[PDB]
Amino acid sequence: KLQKQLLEAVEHKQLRPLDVQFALTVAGDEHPAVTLAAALLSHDAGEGHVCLPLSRLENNEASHPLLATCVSEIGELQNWEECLLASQAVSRGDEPTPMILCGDRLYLNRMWCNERTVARFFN
Amino acid sequence: LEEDPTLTPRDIIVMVADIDSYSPFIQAVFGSAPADRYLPYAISDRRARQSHPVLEAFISLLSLPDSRFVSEDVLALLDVPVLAARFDITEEGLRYLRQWVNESGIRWGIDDDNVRELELPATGQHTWRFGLTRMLLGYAMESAQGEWQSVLPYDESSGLIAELVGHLASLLMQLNIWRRGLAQERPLEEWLPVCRDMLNAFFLPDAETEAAMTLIEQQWQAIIAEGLGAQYGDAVPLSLLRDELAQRLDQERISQRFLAGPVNICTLMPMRSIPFKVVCLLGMNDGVYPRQLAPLGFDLMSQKPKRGDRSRRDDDRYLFLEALISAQQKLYISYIGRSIQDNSERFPSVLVQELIDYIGQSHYLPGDEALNCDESEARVKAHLTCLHTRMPFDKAHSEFVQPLPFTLPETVPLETLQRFWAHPVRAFFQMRLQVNFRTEDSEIPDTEPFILEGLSRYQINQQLLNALVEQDDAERLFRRFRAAGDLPYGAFGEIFWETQCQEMQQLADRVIACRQPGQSMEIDLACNGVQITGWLPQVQPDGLLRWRPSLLSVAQGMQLWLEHLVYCASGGNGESRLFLRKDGEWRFPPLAAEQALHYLSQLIEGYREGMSAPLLVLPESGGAWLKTCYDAQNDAMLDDDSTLQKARTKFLQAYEGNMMVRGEGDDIWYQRLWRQLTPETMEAIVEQSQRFLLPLFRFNQ
Amino acid sequence: SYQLPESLEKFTPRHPLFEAIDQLLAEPLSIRDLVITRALAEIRETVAREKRRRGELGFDDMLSRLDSALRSESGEVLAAAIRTRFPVAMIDEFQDTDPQQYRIFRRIWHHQPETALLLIGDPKQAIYAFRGADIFTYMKARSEVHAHYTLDTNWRSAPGMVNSVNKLFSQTDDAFMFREIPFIPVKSAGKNQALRFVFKGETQPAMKMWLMEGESCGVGDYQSTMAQVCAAQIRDWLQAGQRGEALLMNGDDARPVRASDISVLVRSRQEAAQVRDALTLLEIPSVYLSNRDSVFETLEAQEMLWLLQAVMTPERENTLRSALATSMMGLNALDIETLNNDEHAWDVVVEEFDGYRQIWRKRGVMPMLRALMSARNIAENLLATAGGERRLTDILHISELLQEAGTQLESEHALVRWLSQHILEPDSNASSQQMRLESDKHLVQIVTIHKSKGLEYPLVWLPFITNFRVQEQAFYHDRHSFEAVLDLNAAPESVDLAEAERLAEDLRLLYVALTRSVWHCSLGVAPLVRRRGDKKGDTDVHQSALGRLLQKGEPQDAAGLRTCIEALCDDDIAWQTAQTG
Amino acid sequence: ELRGRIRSNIHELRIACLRETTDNPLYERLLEEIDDKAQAAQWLLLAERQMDEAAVFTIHGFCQRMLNLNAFESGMLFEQQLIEDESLLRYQACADFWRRHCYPLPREIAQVVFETWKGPQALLRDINRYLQGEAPVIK
Amino acid sequence: SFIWDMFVRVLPEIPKESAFNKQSMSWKLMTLLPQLLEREDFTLLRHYLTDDSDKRKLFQLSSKAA
Numbered sequence A: 001k002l003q004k005q006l007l008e009a010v011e012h013k014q015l016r017p018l019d020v021q022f023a024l025t026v027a028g029d030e031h032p033a034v035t036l037a038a039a040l041l042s043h044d045a046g047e048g049h050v051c052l053p054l055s056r057l058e059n060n061e062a063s064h065p066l067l068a069t070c071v072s073e074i075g076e077l078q079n080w081e082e083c084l085l086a087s088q089a090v091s092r093g094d095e096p097t098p099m100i101l102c103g104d105r106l107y108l109n110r111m112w113c114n115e116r117t118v119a120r121f122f123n
Numbered sequence B: 001l002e003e004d005p006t007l008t009p010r011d012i013i014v015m016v017a018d019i020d021s022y023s024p025f026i027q028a029v030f031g032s033a034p035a036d037r038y039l040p041y042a043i044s045d046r047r048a049r050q051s052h053p054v055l056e057a058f059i060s061l062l063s064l065p066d067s068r069f070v071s072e073d074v075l076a077l078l079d080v081p082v083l084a085a086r087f088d089i090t091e092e093g094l095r096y097l098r099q100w101v102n103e104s105g106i107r108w109g110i111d112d113d114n115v116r117e118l119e120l121p122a123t124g125q126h127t128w129r130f131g132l133t134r135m136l137l138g139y140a141m142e143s144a145q146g147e148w149q150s151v152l153p154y155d156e157s158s159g160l161i162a163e164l165v166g167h168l169a170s171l172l173m174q175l176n177i178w179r180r181g182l183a184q185e186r187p188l189e190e191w192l193p194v195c196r197d198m199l200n201a202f203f204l205p206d207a208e209t210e211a212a213m214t215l216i217e218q219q220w221q222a223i224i225a226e227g228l229g230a231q232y233g234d235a236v237p238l239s240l241l242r243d244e245l246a247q248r249l250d251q252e253r254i255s256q257r258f259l260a261g262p263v264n265i266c267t268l269m270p271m272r273s274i275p276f277k278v279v280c281l282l283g284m285n286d287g288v289y290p291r292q293l294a295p296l297g298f299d300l301m302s303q304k305p306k307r308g309d310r311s312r313r314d315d316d317r318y319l320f321l322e323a324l325i326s327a328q329q330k331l332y333i334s335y336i337g338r339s340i341q342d343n344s345e346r347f348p349s350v351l352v353q354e355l356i357d358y359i360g361q362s363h364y365l366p367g368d369e370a371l372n373c374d375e376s377e378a379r380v381k382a383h384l385t386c387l388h389t390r391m392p393f394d395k396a397h398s399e400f401v402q403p404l405p406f407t408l409p410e411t412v413p414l415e416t417l418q419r420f421w422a423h424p425v426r427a428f429f430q431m432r433l434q435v436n437f438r439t440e441d442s443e444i445p446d447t448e449p450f451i452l453e454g455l456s457r458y459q460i461n462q463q464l465l466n467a468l469v470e471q472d473d474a475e476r477l478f479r480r481f482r483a484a485g486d487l488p489y490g491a492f493g494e495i496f497w498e499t500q501c502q503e504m505q506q507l508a509d510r511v512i513a514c515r516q517p518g519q520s521m522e523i524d525l526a527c528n529g530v531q532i533t534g535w536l537p538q539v540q541p542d543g544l545l546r547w548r549p550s551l552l553s554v555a556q557g558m559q560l561w562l563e564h565l566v567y568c569a570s571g572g573n574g575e576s577r578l579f580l581r582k583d584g585e586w587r588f589p590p591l592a593a594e595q596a597l598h599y600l601s602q603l604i605e606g607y608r609e610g611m612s613a614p615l616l617v618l619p620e621s622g623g624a625w626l627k628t629c630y631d632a633q634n635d636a637m638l639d640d641d642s643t644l645q646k647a648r649t650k651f652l653q654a655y656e657g658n659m660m661v662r663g664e665g666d667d668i669w670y671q672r673l674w675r676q677l678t679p680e681t682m683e684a685i686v687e688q689s690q691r692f693l694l695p696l697f698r699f700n701q
Numbered sequence C: 001s002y003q004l005p006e007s008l009e010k011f012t013p014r015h016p017l018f019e020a021i022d023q024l025l026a027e028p029l030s031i032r033d034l035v036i037t038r039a040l041a042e043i044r045e046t047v048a049r050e051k052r053r054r055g056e057l058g059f060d061d062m063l064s065r066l067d068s069a070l071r072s073e074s075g076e077v078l079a080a081a082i083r084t085r086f087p088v089a090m091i092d093e094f095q096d097t098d099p100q101q102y103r104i105f106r107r108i109w110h111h112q113p114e115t116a117l118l119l120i121g122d123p124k125q126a127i128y129a130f131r132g133a134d135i136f137t138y139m140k141a142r143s144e145v146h147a148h149y150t151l152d153t154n155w156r157s158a159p160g161m162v163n164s165v166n167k168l169f170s171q172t173d174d175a176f177m178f179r180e181i182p183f184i185p186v187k188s189a190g191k192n193q194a195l196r197f198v199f200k201g202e203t204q205p206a207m208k209m210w211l212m213e214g215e216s217c218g219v220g221d222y223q224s225t226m227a228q229v230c231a232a233q234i235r236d237w238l239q240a241g242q243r244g245e246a247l248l249m250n251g252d253d254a255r256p257v258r259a260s261d262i263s264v265l266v267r268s269r270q271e272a273a274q275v276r277d278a279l280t281l282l283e284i285p286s287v288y289l290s291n292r293d294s295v296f297e298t299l300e301a302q303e304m305l306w307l308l309q310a311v312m313t314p315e316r317e318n319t320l321r322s323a324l325a326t327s328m329m330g331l332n333a334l335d336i337e338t339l340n341n342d343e344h345a346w347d348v349v350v351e352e353f354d355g356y357r358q359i360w361r362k363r364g365v366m367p368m369l370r371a372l373m374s375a376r377n378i379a380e381n382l383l384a385t386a387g388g389e390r391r392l393t394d395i396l397h398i399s400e401l402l403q404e405a406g407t408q409l410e411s412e413h414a415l416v417r418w419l420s421q422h423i424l425e426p427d428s429n430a431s432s433q434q435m436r437l438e439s440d441k442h443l444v445q446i447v448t449i450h451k452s453k454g455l456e457y458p459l460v461w462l463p464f465i466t467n468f469r470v471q472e473q474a475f476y477h478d479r480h481s482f483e484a485v486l487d488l489n490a491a492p493e494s495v496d497l498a499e500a501e502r503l504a505e506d507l508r509l510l511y512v513a514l515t516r517s518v519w520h521c522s523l524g525v526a527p528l529v530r531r532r533g534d535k536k537g538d539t540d541v542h543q544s545a546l547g548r549l550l551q552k553g554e555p556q557d558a559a560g561l562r563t564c565i566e567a568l569c570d571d572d573i574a575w576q577t578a579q580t581g
Numbered sequence D: 001e002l003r004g005r006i007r008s009n010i011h012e013l014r015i016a017c018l019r020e021t022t023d024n025p026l027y028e029r030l031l032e033e034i035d036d037k038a039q040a041a042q043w044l045l046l047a048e049r050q051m052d053e054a055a056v057f058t059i060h061g062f063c064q065r066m067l068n069l070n071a072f073e074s075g076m077l078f079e080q081q082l083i084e085d086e087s088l089l090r091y092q093a094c095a096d097f098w099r100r101h102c103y104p105l106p107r108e109i110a111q112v113v114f115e116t117w118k119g120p121q122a123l124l125r126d127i128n129r130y131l132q133g134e135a136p137v138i139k
Numbered sequence E: 001s002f003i004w005d006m007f008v009r010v011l012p013e014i015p016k017e018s019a020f021n022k023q024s025m026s027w028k029l030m031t032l033l034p035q036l037l038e039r040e041d042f043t044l045l046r047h048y049l050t051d052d053s054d055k056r057k058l059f060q061l062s063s064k065a066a
Helices: A003-011 A018-026 A032-047 A054-060 A064-071 A081-085 A109-123 B023-031 B052-062 B069-076 B079-085 B092-102 B112-117 B128-140 B163-179 B194-203 B210-229 B238-249 B310-325 B350-360 B373-384 B414-422 B425-434 B455-468 B475-486 B492-512 B554-570 B594-610 B619-629 B643-655 B668-673 B679-692 B695-699 C017-026 C032-054 C059-072 C075-085 C099-109 C134-144 C159-169 C219-240 C272-280 C299-312 C317-324 C333-343 C343-363 C366-377 C379-384 C388-406 C414-423 C492-513 C545-551 C558-567 D001-019 D026-033 D037-046 D059-066 D086-100 D107-116 D120-130 E002-011 E024-036 E043-049 E056-065
Strands: A100-102 A104-109 B012-016 B042-044 B263-267 B276-281 B327-333 B411-413 B519-528 B528-540 B546-549 B576-579 B585-588 C193-198 C246-249 C262-266 C286-288 C442-448 C457-461 C484-486 C517-521
Touching: A003 A018, A018 A032, A018 B163, A018 C388, A032 A054, A032 A064, A032 A081, A032 A104, A054 C299, A081 A100, A081 B052, A100 A109, A100 C442, A104 A109, A109 B475, B012 B519, B023 C366, B023 C388, B052 B194, B052 B210, B052 B238, B069 B079, B069 C484, B092 B163, B092 B576, B128 B163, B163 B194, B194 B210, B210 B238, B210 E024, B238 E056, B310 B327, B350 B373, B350 D001, B411 B414, B414 B425, B414 B554, B425 B594, B425 B668, B455 B475, B455 B492, B475 B492, B475 C075, B492 B546, B492 B576, B492 D107, B519 B554, B519 B594, B528 B554, B554 B576, B554 B585, B554 B594, B554 B695, B619 B679, B619 B695, B668 C299, B695 C366, C032 D086, C032 D120, C059 C075, C059 D059, C099 C134, C159 C517, C193 C517, C219 C272, C262 C272, C272 C286, C272 C442, C299 C317, C299 C343, C299 C366, C299 C388, C299 C414, C317 C333, C317 C343, C333 C343, C343 C366, C366 C388, C379 C388, C388 C414, C442 C492, C492 C545, C545 C558, D001 D037, D037 D107, D086 D120, E024 E056
Parallel strands: B012 B263, B012 B276, B042 B263, B276 B327, B411 B528, B546 B576, C262 C442, C262 C457, C286 C442, C457 C517
Antiparallel strands: A100 A104, B519 B528, B576 B585, C193 C246
8 A cells, every 4th residue: 555655755754654653553444545634644743733724735745646546435535524534533522532623624632622622712 | 920030921821621611700800800910811712702782683583483572572672772773762762662661561472463373362452563552542642531442542652752652663564574574485596685685674884883794794695605506496494594594603713812922711722732831721620521522323433443533532631641741830730629509529530630649659758758658649649739718718887877966947747747657767768868779660571460469459449449439330440441451351350340349349338338528628736836737638527537448557547646636736626537448447536635736746756856866666566566565454554474475476476577478577678777686676666666656555446 | 968868867768859969969060170181281282392493402301202212113223222332220319210210221121131230229218209209119110120138237326326216116017108118127337336425424315205294285385395495405415515524435535515516307497487596595506508598589689789770870869879878888877978968079989980880881790899899898897797798708699690691691781680680580590599608617507308318417306206287189199000190089098098108208207317316316296186176085196107106096195105105215215204494 | 429439449449459458348358359360450450541431320411312322213303402491481381371261261151260260370380290290190 | 725735736627626515515415315215225314304394304414414
């Protein structure tokens, strides 16, 4: 799959091997779009990002033909919200899941607690 | 060398029968020689150790797929600085790795596929994959929510120090890939680049390493070159090549510093005879010289002994005579005479026995010139033999305790008194002169826990008890500890849980039968002109109620005693109670505030004297001595001589340990003060116990 | 309980359920009988298969391999070469043999003349039942061989002692519970007949029992009275012989008694604290030679671990003052108090470890253990302080133990990990035991029976000869085939056979104990009862070894035991009562 | 000790045979039984110098020196590394067994197992004494 | 080596090193022995090796024979 390509990207130093580990261990054999999403969110978390809009990661497509590789699953996967929610590694905020999406933004769940409490503090 | 004026250290030679076992002692003493009595040396025929950790690590990697990959062996591989620098592992992060692999529960093999390969049932936990899953879910999220795929998060890593996790992960996938690779049999022409691939895949070369890399590459090239030039075509497994490499690598030796100039140490090379003035020999016991090598069994030369044959036995017998005739001035012959363990008898070799027999039958001492041939022979044998001793050495320490000055602050915390009174003997050391015995971190456990004992099961019992007093569920907490991996696999966890909960229920319902809603309160009271400040947590308004899953002890009860004293100092009418296991109970009645302050003053002066000099207050053995002697009916001191032996018996049997209880005397805090218990210190301890602990039984009920 | 059909006159069956209930009760229900065998096969199989992939070898495996090579068809060819090479065999101490080894010997040398075989051993002194040594193979061999010879001389002990030990074992025939070990009398030597032991003029009886006073007694009384009594008599001998009162002469050449010529023999270890404390209460030097304790148990290992840790990490104040606070540096409260407040004197000790660690890295293990030994000059400190030689010798022994690891290992983390690794596990290796601090001068020796084989002593005591412990584990040999057959279910017949074998072993122990006393030895005896109710008239002395020698299997009491003692009491054996004094 | 006593005995016997006058009665009766003193002395001279390789062994040493002499029938390796800490190996093996024969067992079956003993450590401690040596026949 | 140098100097048509070396006959015997087995004279080696082997005993025998 993508393990050799992302090891090559680690040799390219664009994406951290820690991001590779996080994406591998919470993806396994799930959707490749979910794997790339986990890798990029772990990458910006290692950068120090706090928010992550879906449009930015969608139109980045830094390493791979994202659309032409991701379109393999059931139905219209372009509706990315429940396309991700089909996977077991994300939840809307009901279960103790590492991945939570609230405002069309996908990020870490402790960071989701912090971001939702400051978002309800702000707006 | 002091007796003779001029003799060059070039002109002294010492041979030895066996070199490798003798070498560490020679090197140690010749490196530990003093300043003026120093003389250099030059050891020859040392075993070749050029890059020892690198060679051992590469041999361990070449022994990969047949190992179960214990975490101890993994870290004993990981300690190498070259691998640490290549896989960017730092020494400061190595401690974090040590504690995380010790506490996160990584004990068994690498992965469940390997476990199933070894035909064992798939446990599904306690692997490196399980530990990394634990670590990464701890990085992702806290351990308060629960479980995501029935594995427990591990909140010891949630910061920027988490890079070592991915480093170790990359290391373990490299190990997994090469474990898959290095199993199948291959022919020689593709066994050729495997060593090169391993070297470039693992090791970043350093300034020194290239010698070791060249040695490994040259040996690999030579082995497969011999194989290819010998015209073999079939595939061969990895084990034969691994053992051949391991045998051939250490077969190299050093014979490059024979005549450096200082004194020389070497084994007896065959036919080697050089003139010298001083020749010394070592280790001529029986059974070690000459070394006996039996023929292989199918030899035909040994059946027909011809003229030109060579035997190792006769070679050594010739070398001894050649070494004897190759001496000019002095000879130094020594052997191990008596075994040092049981003082039994050993014997010198037959060659030395023949030499001393010829010497004894050769000459006579000048004393008894005409007495008897055999008596003169025995006298010469006794005179020439020298006998050494077993030990080379064939102000005193004072009493450790000394008086010290100390001041009395007007404001002291309650926690200071509690920590002092918990164990005063070690409290004198741990806080006054700022010394404590910071023991090194323990070993990583070998396998998964079968039974639970000690502090772990004590913490489990405490976590069960603080929910039992709330009467909340036990099943979710049981699932949480099963995800923690602190319970036996399968239904044995439920079997253990049933016994633990049914045993703690009888402690729980007693607390429920008298639990009342209380509150915390802050102590601000003075005694002997000394203000005492402290916080008293969770005190019920109608009395006191404490509970703890532990066995009953006098030091445990005296905490409740001090609690009741400080409670009665702040007004505080009502009794006090404490619950323990086996329904052990304590009861203290309220008293006068002046009496409470009097007892507090007594304890304050006791602390004041104990801080200046380490006052001996044994809480349990002294209590055992003082309890049976005291009679509760008269509230006085019996002093009958009949009890003067029962008290000795029970005090000794409580102090020194049994086979089931840890020895109270087996404690380094007490071992530092003295090596052996003395009756005078016993009487002093009895006196201090009678002076201090005696109010406890006056009001225990 | 009442389903026995005989209970009609006690408390007709008339239906078969009332006797099928006892049929069900007669068979115990357990899974251990299956799981023990199922595990026992596979553990041995798995170990024997796992050793193959490493190619190692063991003493147990080597003899089994040789036996299997005999079991193969080429055994005749394999034995012919051995017969040609060695046409003789001699075996010493034959009492420790296994049926495997005897099968090898029998197969190689049970035939084929021009080749002989000489076996030398003793049916007695076979005290290695837990060392894999079987006694029944000796009788199995004797049922095939038919030449028996016996020596007569002794060369060591007094003729009176020889006569007494002949008489006391000549009480009842075949006393060893076996018709294959008949004790026959032996004679003394003609040059030791002038050996005498006097006490204020006249001589002394060689053998002597000491007896309790009371209808019943327990193990606590057995220890408390007799340890004090034995210590009192040893003190009496020690005080008397120092003034030339009691003498040990062979004819006329006499000498006084000292500490070295006085020893004691015991059974186990847990009892020995009582004997040591009772002996040292009268200020007598006692050493326990039977100890095989590892040196890693003592506090010297802890201090060495602390010193190595502090010299590896000399940065923090706490880890350095931990090393300086140890007893071996030898400081005081004022010393530490001045060391805390003086920054310059603190920094001197800080700076010396900075160079010491570099010397450690450059030089290994041993030279720095020599250098820190020499620098602080703590040899003379422990020489001046009494009892410090025991603390001193363990440091040198630990230093010699560290050299086998300091070369094969190089990382400084590895050695300090290794020391704490061996702290928690006291391995029973022969090199791990403690060396003797003073084996040079006159002390008092306390040794057990198992190490007492072959060591001669002038005089010796024996306090604990009456006590015994009943075996309860099912393990017995057949009375005909002599095969060690193990029974899972509890068979009382097998239990009785095992108890008879255990009693034979205890009598062999008694024969071992009543030797190696050239002048005199003595012991005590009690009418101890294992039963709960005391005065039933049924003592339990005959259950032990010595009780069978006097009661001959009779339930007796103090009066009958007294009559049995004084029946044979004549001028060589002398009896005495013992009071708690 | 036996080898040294043997060497001293043969040396003293050779000297006493060359001097024809002894002190020990055993050597006296042997010298009485001597047929040819010169032949006996020659044999003792040729035998004393061969002492260094004489056959005195333990059982383990004897079989070790015999199998490496004739190991064709055995089929064992020529060179091996000995071992003594087999207790840890047996402790690993018993726990390895206890993993596979207890974990898939159901609760009702495993309850009786839990009653009689808990751990494989105690299981090994119970049955260790019969593992070494020869396995016994089970009634 | 000196005698080999004299051989090279005097006797012609001989290579500088022979094909008979302590490691050469190891692999030569490795190749030869299974082919040479069952010749009605290798029954001892057949009993030694044919029971079970992963060429370890064969390698040891090859080295000893070399």
